[PDB]
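User: These chains co-purify. Model them together.
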Amino acid sequence: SLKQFSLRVEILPSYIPVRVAEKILFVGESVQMFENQNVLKNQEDTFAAELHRLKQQPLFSLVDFEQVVDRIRSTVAEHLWKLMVEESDLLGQLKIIKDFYLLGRGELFQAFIDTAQHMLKTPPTAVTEHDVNVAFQQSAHKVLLDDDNLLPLLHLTIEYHGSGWAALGLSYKVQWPLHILFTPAVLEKYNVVFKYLLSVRRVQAELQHCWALQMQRQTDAIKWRLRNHMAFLVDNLQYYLQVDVLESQFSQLLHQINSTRDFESIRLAHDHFLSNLLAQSFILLKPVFHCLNEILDLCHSFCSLVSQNLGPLDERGAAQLSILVKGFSRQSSLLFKILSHQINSDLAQLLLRLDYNKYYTQ
Amino acid sequence: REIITLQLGQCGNQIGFEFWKQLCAEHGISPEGIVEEFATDRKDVFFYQADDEHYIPRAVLLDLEPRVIHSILNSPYAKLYNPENIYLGNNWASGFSQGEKIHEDIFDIIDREADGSDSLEGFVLCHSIAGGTGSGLGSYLLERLNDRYPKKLVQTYSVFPNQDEDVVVQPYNSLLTLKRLTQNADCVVVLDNTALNRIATDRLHIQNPSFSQINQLVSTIMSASTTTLRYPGYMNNDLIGLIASLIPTPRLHFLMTGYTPLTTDKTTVLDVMRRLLQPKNVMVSTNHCYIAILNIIQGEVDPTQVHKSLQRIRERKLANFIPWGPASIQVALSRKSPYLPSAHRVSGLMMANHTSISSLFERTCRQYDKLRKREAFLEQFRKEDMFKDNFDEMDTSREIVQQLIDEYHAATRPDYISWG
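Assistant: Joint model of the two components:
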């Protein structure tokens, strides 16, 4: 099912439009889908009596043919909404997706990065998959808030032979009524957002470990501190831009879910949610994603260098720390020029940093 | 991790007493520590959990020549603070020498709460600068805690004494405390008795009972500075993640305060930030500039206007800065609590690194410098002289605070990339 059933456009009569046949397709796919897996107010004969009467008419009229199929289109979609949103409540399911794919659980995902830091750092190999799941299971009980089940609908998937943080995919187990709403393709698009959001979440925590090291302790500590705090500014600013979209777009999504009792709006609700969620993250645009990542990656190499010693390090690190503070100053001002659809979230994020005019005055 | 607060000295025990009473009223806690029947907060960090809902805070009360501590004990709230951890001069040297003999038992009192908690991150000291018994003992305890807990971090809610300048050895005492705090304090939040007194004259007619009423002002600052930890949120869900933005350089770890409705007994976010940047709301008494500014708002705040509000504050340019530090102001938000009055429905506070606190350090250094040339109060008491025959710890403290003053003005300079 949901396959071997499709429009054939070349055989479609010209006076019959494509839109009405799409409604025909929808009511057919719906009544097929909840027809099987059974192991229904009977307007089957009255709609037959409608279609028997429509057979007796000599002349083809389109607006009557549109009216009768859209009557059967709305009646099947009004039910299939009511079965899905009430018996198999979607609002709880979308909450679990945001909590784990979109990092909505902050206590757990920060503790999982904290507890499993070394073993995700180590390169991938076939036995690393069970290791990160039991630590994620330990992270679930580290943040002791734990109900019953809630946990066997989620696991971690590492892939090896085709830095274990790079191959860290999250996957959810969907039920049958939500299997058309959640195909593998959309959870695949959910997967790229999960890898990006956990990256910037990782950078913020270990940078504050550099701050915490620097404050418990000459010169060359107080040059790292400049380099730490210069990198700290744009790092908390970028995640705060991601804070703004995840609040604003998810409030939009739940609202058009509850807007009407049509199943068609529920599908269009989820399409409007993802298109804005991908856009404000700027991940579909190439050069901004291809420059913000190395901003985090050069900060990883700086944060390793300060983590090397509490003693002052001019053993070839001050050579490239001065390279780093000039290389970071260049690219962060380069993205500041790029930030300066004209979306309110992207354009107003600038004059956070322009409150000091700090990169512009330079 | 859970926070243990080390309230010490008479004034510090007063403000810790009032701080925990305010958090009793603000959270769902009765004066006996019981969960309130009328009652969504993160009470784990600040309040230990007993089994029958006795929310006893992790307060460590130290008394030395105790008077106000007996008054603390005869209170309705004496059952609320029950970890049973109270263990029995006006000179810094007397307070230090008195702390040295009882250091092991008071440190075992530290150790017991450290073991009893699941975890421990910070030691938040209700310290009194030049506070007689409080100063000296607070500096010695500050010096012990970073050695015993090197990974851990120590905050100091210093009530820096300015009373228009009675203690005649007050600049000497404050001078020694500030050296201990600059090398051995991870963070310091500064407060001023003159600035709180001028605010007392502003908002009310209170002049003679200045201390008792300023306790409430200090306590409002102290609760609102921790509300974003005590209540869950998106960002600054831990102390160290908060303190990172406020302190860019470890020598300048000193933080100013302010509150938008000083008379907190509808206002939009643009209005409250603009009111906050004005100097009347500030509670602290050559170019000069902030290094970094942060703000937290609690109340009926609209979300699409907070970004536009910081846009409007940026257009206003009411706060002036050109530091070495790049940290720009951010609009943060916390949860206003229920059951207590929601008057001034939107209400906020600021914490900032600003170079004008170096002037107030330099004021007690100037008083110390004139007193040090006069030698009018070297005290020459046998405690003071037998503890410091050389009297050179005052000179080491003078050179360390002079480094701090020069570091502040070098942070004002365009080149703090170089040597500060």
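The longest strand of chain B covers residues 290-299.
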